[PDB]
Amino acid sequence: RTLFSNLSDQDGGAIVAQLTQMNIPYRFANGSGAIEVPADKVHELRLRLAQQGLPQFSEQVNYQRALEGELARTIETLGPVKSARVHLAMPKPSLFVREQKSPSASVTVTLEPGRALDEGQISAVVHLVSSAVAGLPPGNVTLVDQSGHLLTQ
């Protein structure tokens, strides 16, 4: 299954280097800028790579919803995470001409009783989400737990 698509050559190369180091089989889709990898490893690998910093309405909505769902699924592969919800809020093509807008994301996680996300895991989530959405800076990702505690500084 596709690990990543639409990668820069630089990111692609970095991702391939990491996969080789981890001894994970991979197949870079020919001229598809995509890297199909073991289906059962896709989510774990996305997270791991994120930790190392790598890399119509209905459709949009659907797309957005699909993206949200995928991101949630990936985040749920983290050990301490029981469930995750991702909400993406990219304003519709800035109607206002002068004012400038920017995409943001809100991530809510339900943690396993007695478990917490560490700083690394938190950073991985933030990176994963930011990388998935064009123009979404890490700073515009808010990560909260079930109790509403802000995890992202």
Binding site: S147, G148, H149, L150
Partner: peptide, 27 residues
Amino acid sequence: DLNDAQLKFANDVESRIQRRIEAILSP
């Protein structure tokens, strides 16, 4: 410039007060 920094400071304070209220009002 500085006004935007002050406004962001106010927004963060308001958001944290909101979250503190929500935390106890949730259970």
